[PDB]
Specification:
part of a larger assembly, 9 chains, A mainly alpha (39), B mainly alpha (274), C mainly alpha (254), A: 2 helices, B: 274 residues, mainly alpha, two-stranded antiparallel ribbon, 4 strands, binds copper (II) ion, membrane (chains C, E, F)
Chain lengths: 39, 274, 254, 274, 254, 254, 274, 39, 39
């Protein structure tokens, strides 16, 4: 159909950014934890 | 105030049928309660009753591990029966309540009023918060595997913190003849047990591989882990306990398994009732 | 409407009160004759009191079994009467069967729960476990056979008055009864373990784990109640919903 | 004088078929006897043969408990096979007779005529009254669960009284070097066993929890109780031992279980024979 | 009527007498060479006598297996001959199969019963168990492989001359033979237990319990005989009752 | 022909390289902070380094689970879209499901094989096992939850994007994932055995046998792959052999 | 050069289908390799890894018995899977290769480059010839019971002779402080193991019932015998591991096991493709 | 029918007396045993 | 048929000689081994 090509072209670009905003954060949130000595 | 009239209308019960159903409930439910009391009490006392009887057996290694593993067994099977057959979420709580009723009756009449032991020395005590949280997990998740995991973790973890208000004050130190004891230990020595000497206590003893500050915590997790297994196993045992068939025979004399089926549960039976 | 056509509870109440009174009498006998005549097993008074009670149990319980089982088997329903049974009378008979189950389960509660922690209680005020200790007499020789009789009688009634139970063999019921039944022969294992190197100090000892495995059969109440509820639903459909009787005779045929 | 002609007429066997059936019996029954001898003898000797071999191993604790539990196993399975397949009630007696035949052959040729031990020192002895009563119970009750209970009780209880006439005289006291011995003990010491020293005897030793006057009685009941279990278990094993199917295959190469059925046992086959 | 068309027993009798004579020869060899040359395992005479007998067994038993199995597999019936088999000849072949089973079971009796208590008898006149003790040679290296050959040969014959056995795989027969067969490799467990901390003093020791579990497979004679009796009844119906042959080829198809 | 319509591997490659880099970082952290700050568990530097890493794991792994599971469950296919799914897109989605399985299995390899012998290696250079030893932090608190997230995510994707997995419950897949999943709670058994009388000296100790029994569930890959191959053959028949789509919706109905 | 074109023509695969199948193989086979590495490595190290790690644990009693019994388990199941599903004979070899790859990776990175132990002290070593011969037996016989017998015998027998070239030179005698040691023993003492003292070695110790010249030989046969059992058992476990069904539900909410079937494997499907 | 109402009215009065003649006896037979010391 | 009577009359005389040539040999091959001390 078309909604297939489009719903799936939207989850390619959607999935490749929940990957790149989690890569960055998870490395920044764990340093803030490592370098801050929380606990 | 719940939705009972809708349930009764969906079941297509005339008022006499409703009254007959109410009589069935009023007859069968006390029977199930008494059976749970008896059988669950026997199972618990003959698998974990020794730590249950005495104050000085409640330790950091064996009591909080043995007790929940033994307790989860009947709870899982009764929860399976109730939930699968009638969608009733109060199985584990009912099991533990029956166990505690039986335990209190025997402690008051057997240990105290016959054997002259003090009541405070024979507090069992409770295992109820874990059963309640297991019931809540089963109701909220509706999945028995997620229930196995989370509820078994809760059952194995909440045992010691839930019993600490009862047996925490019994750990205050006392000095007798220049020797340090826990008050539970001095209570155990004070009230003579002719059949139970000191060396039979299966309690912690310390080890060179042991972290004394973490003992209970480790005992809190191991007892949890096995619980997650035990639940699952006994859940399948529930399917064994609900096996209801007849050995019918005919002609050559051959025996065949036969199942009696509910007519109301068939495809078109409810529509043809009217 | 008429309650009496499908419900009666006089026998259930009588059995319940009688079992409670028997248990109370056992408790009073234990509290009156254990410290004064039950401490030493070699004394003549120990014989006269506790072995006398044991003999009373050994003579009464077989008589109980004989009377109950013979009455149940003697007033039996023929295959003709079990084929044209009035479904209202079938509802009443299923209520009776549930009440027999309740009496049996009350006996199991008395045997396995109350008169067992009372035994652990006795195991700690005596030097070592004997064989006819005050406790044993009341349960091992009293409560144990008591529930067993009720169990057989329960099944007996069902497979004599309930056509379905006279037709096929209620698998769950079999185990539900056989369990506590086989618990009594486990007294041999108990004694053999106590007297020899299986140790005696703990009450939750491995030799006491035969009772738990045999009492796990009491959890077949799930299958028993499933059969009871299925038949009750079929009877409700037949009697009140004006449905065909064929649902009562279709699924338990050869 | 029994009803054999009626049975043969009901089976619809021509005289040549009757002769062929008689030849089948005369060929197969000795084969079953020899198989029972061999396998039952191996099982009994490798599970309970040590108490069987020597007079001084026949004690009040282990011999009357181990022997019936080991003996009931093959008896239950062979009784299942015979009763279920052919309605023949002589299973347990046949098993014990085969075991005793094998035992006597080996004791005479192995222990006595090769190893130079006296025959009286190696009496096995009998386990036959319990098997006979079990067979009678199975025939008279026709129910295998009532048979399990009553016959297992008989099998576990009658072992010691039935063997007492054989080994009772061996318990007469003797005094050697100022030490009291049973005559079986002095027979064991007199005839040297290079491979069997004294300390390997698994016999009674007494305990502070033991009632010496009741020992055998307790051993008579425990051995009974387990028998009631063992029978039942091995009865189900009989159903495993009678499993007779073929792995047939076709096309994709798929394997299916297939059962060969008796044509005479069908619904209308006997009527169409004529 | 003609007996010879469906019955023959010459091979069965020959095998029985030959096995009995072999066992008698083994007994005579044990009684003549055990006390004089079998006491010490390091003596040259022990080699020359008992290891010579062991070598004779190790050279003869594989030859026995080769000859028997090759003859059975070489004179095989084609699928054409097994589809139009004369039912009288099928009765004769089932008698032959039962006789092969009888020879196999006689071998099992010699291995597991007679030459085993004779071993316990030897275990008490020697200091400790060896590996090629007089007893072992006759059974472990003689009786054991002997019955195994017969077992294979038995099945071989059946699945070569009996169409049903050539069609499907007689599950019970498989176990009935595999059991005593797998008993021979259990000699490894026996030796490993004897030589190390599994103890050696008792003959009814836990390391000797592999033989009982493996010989429990000999109780699948129930299924074997059930198959034999079912086929015998079908053949009786076909041959003498003039019934259709379709009952012989209907239930063991794909 | 067009490869891209039924195949894509960017996410698989990214996950593989990311997992490899995370494992390499764990290895570098162990080799840089274990001998200098991981020898004593009571030192403040031990806290600041290894308990800091433990806290980082405890804060990041739940975030990983939340993000992955929420994204998978949020971009879900409705029952309408899963009923008229393009079979080429179904082939692509099955490739994606296999790649999710591959990522999960890479996590299991890192947890159970590499960072486990590295632990035995650490168990021999230290006096006794602790609870947050350099090794533990990287695997028990890092590798273990890591593969578990991937496992859930794998199933999640399948039962969200694969109609068959959204229809019935892939029994083999359940066990394949539940196994290594339940391995993490077995750390309780590990610690309880180490700290008490289950001994600690051996690495192949009976308390370490919970992991092998729970990882035997990883052998249900046979059933997983059987389902995958059956669906792949059906899709090949539908797409390229011009066969009817009814083979895709016939066997997994009620 | 094998017969691949005939196989592809019999499968009725268009070229795009062939390319898609090749991609399936290239994706799935590394996944199976990695899973075997991980799971088989965990199982082997936690059941038999202690004798695997150190040179002085490789003895004549426990190493050549424990190692093949543990190793045969995964091999039998993976061989079942491959042979039954795809007719591929390289199961056991693949399992052992994966185990050795994982072992070498961990020994180089964990034991040597992190714990500073020498590489020669941690040779595992090989178990490959037995797996290869088991694969060859399975391919040549095509029967899994004959494969069980012969291949289990090979697997249990060839372990010690196949490892002797690696660990034979380590048995050369050395004299330290007037005491005789094997060179493996002195290597074990030289390189300190803080967590592994001497007394934890489960190695031979000699016995009064032991024939020192036959020890390994006996260990070579026992390990064989159990292997013949273990294979068989795990072969059935393979059928458990290939169980592939779905829990589907409908209407009353009832759950039924449902199997997805291969359409190409049906009776007339291949003929109707054209 | 009628035989139902009557066969069942006869086992009510029949069962309530095998209960009251066993209650009495069992208490009289066990005392005669208790107070007589038989054995 | 006839091939049945003949194929089976040929395996009777065939089987009774693989029995009598194995009886003899096996006794001669094991003596040659016993009296020669091979090994
Ligand atoms: Cu007691
Ligand atoms: Cu021996
Ligand atoms: Cu560790």
């Amino acid at each position: 159909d078309a909604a297939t090509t489009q719903r799936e072209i939207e989850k390619n670009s959607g999935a490749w950014k929940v990957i790149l905003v989690s890569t960055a954060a998870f490395i920044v949130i764990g340093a803030i934890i490592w370098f801050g000595g929380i606990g | 105030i719940f939705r009972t009239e809708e349930i009764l209308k969906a079941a297509k019960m005339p008022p006499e049928a409703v009254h007959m159903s109410r009589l069935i409930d009023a007859v069968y439910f006390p029977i199930l309660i008494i059976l749970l009391v008896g059988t669950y009490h026997m199972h618990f006392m003959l698998l974990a009753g020794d730590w249950d009887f005495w104050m000085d057996w409640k330790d950091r290694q064996w009591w909080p591990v043995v007790t929940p593993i033994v307790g989860i067994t009947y709870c899982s099977a009764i929860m399976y029966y109730l939930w699968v057959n009638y969608r009733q979420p109060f199985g584990a709580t009912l099991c533990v309540v029956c166990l505690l009723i039986g335990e209190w009756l025997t402690r008051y009449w057997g240990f105290y009023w016959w054997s002259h032991y003090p009541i405070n020395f024979v507090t069992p005590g409770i295992m109820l918060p874990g059963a309640l949280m297991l019931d809540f997990t089963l109701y909220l998740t509706r999945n028995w595997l997620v229930t196995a995991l989370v509820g078994g973790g809760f059952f194995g973890l909440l045992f010691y913190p839930g019993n600490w208000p009862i047996f925490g004050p019994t750990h205050l130190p006392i000095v007798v003849e220049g020797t340090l004891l826990s008050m539970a230990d001095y209570m155990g020595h004070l009230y003579v047990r002719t059949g139970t000497p000191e060396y039979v206590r299966h309690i912690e003893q310390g080890s060179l591989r042991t972290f004394g500050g973490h003992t209970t915590v480790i005992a809190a997790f191991f007892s949890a882990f096995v619980s997650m297994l035990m639940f699952t196993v006994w859940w399948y045992l529930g399917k064994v306990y609900c096996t209801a068939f007849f050995y019918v025979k005919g002609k050559r004399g051959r025996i065949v398994h036969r199942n009696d089926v509910t007519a109301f549960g068939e495809e078109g039976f409810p529509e043809g009732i009217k | 409407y008429d309650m009496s056509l499908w419900y009666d509870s006089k026998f259930y109440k009588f059995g319940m009160i009688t079992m409670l009174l028997v248990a109370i009498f056992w408790v009073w006998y234990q509290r009156y004759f254990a410290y004064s005549h039950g401490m030493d097993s070699m004394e003549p008074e120990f014989d006269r009191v506790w072995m006398g009670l044991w003999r009373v149990h050994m003579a009464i319980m077989p008589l109980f079994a004989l009377v109950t089982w013979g009455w149940i088997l003697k007033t039996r329903d023929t295959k003709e009467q079990l084929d044209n049974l009035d479904p209202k009378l079938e509802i009443k008979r299923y209520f009776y069967y549930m009440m027999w189950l309740g009496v049996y389960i009350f006996g199991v509660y008395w045997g396995g729960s109350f008169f067992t922690e009372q035994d652990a209680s006795w195991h700690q005020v005596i030097i070592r476990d004997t064989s006819f200790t005050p406790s044993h007499v009341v349960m091992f020789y009293g409560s144990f056979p008591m529930y067993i009789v009720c169990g057989v009688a329960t099944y007996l009634y069902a497979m004599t008055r309930l056509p379905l139970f006279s037709r096929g063999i209620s698998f769950p019921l079999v185990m539900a009864i056989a369990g506590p039944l086989m618990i009594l022969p486990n007294v041999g294992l108990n004694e053999w373990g106590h007297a020899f190197w299986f140790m005696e100090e703990l009450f939750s000892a491995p030799l006491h784990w035969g009772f738990v495995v045999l009492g796990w059969a009491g959890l077949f109440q799930g299958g028993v109640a499933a059969q009871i509820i299925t038949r009750y639903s079929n009877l409700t459909d037949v009697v009140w919903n004006n449905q065909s009787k064929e649902i009562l005779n279709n699924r338990i045929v050869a």
